[PDB]
């Protein structure tokens, strides 16, 4: 009764995928829309969540590559629709993506940074770990999107 797709294989469903995240974290439409569009069947890529007809999109995650760790990667933008939290699917689709990387695409650790989320993580089965940068020295982050309370977590697949 639930699928979980990679989003480039069903564009049409990006436009309520772009709504999803922006509920949660408002950004244009169009960066939305970039991201989404970046999806492929390595990385980065972009799961979704649906019902069976996919005439809802339940749930959304990114997986995306870190520069320094070719078997690695790092999950972000999880986010469950509104109408649907406290029910088992965000745990649902984290689960997915961990087989999907370890089993489609050969990696062996999923990274993420949170702020006030870690006990989710930690009830299915992510661990603190030492900090990690996503991007490599090619990259500089703008200091005002640095956040004290960022907390890393790492769960070996
Ligand atoms: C890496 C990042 O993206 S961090 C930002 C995470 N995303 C967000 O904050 C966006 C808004 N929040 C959400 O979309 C959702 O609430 C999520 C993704 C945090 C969790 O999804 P949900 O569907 O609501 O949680 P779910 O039903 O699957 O519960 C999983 C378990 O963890 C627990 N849990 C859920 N959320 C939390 C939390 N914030 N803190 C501690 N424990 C939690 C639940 O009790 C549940 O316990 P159980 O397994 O024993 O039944």
């Given at each position: 009764p639930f699928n979980v797709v990679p989003i480039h294989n069903y564009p049409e469903l990006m436009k309520d995928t772009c709504a999803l995240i922006n509920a949660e974290w408002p950004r244009s439409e169009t960066a939305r829309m970039r991201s989404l569009e970046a999806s492929c069947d390595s990385l980065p890529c972009s799961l979704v969540l649906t019902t069976e007809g996919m005439c809802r999109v339940i749930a959304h995650l990114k997986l995306s590559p870190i520069?320094?760790?070719?078997?690695?990667?790092?999950?972000?933008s999880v986010v469950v629709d509104k109408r649907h939290r406290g029910?088992?699917?965000?745990?649902?689709?984290?689960?997915?993506?961990?087989?999907?990387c370890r089993v489609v695409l050969d990696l062996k650790t999923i990274?993420?940074?949170?702020?006030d989320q870690d006990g989710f993580y930690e009830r299915i089965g992510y661990e603190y770990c030492a900090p990690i940068t996503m991007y490599g020295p090619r990259h500089?982050?703008?200091?005002?999107?640095?956040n004290a309370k960022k907390k890393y977590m790492k769960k070996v697949l």
């Open positions: 520069n320094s760790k070719k078997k690695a990667c790092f999950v972000e029910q088992g699917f965000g745990k649902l689709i984290m689960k997915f993506a961990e087989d999907y990274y993420l940074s949170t702020i500089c982050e703008l200091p005002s999107l640095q």
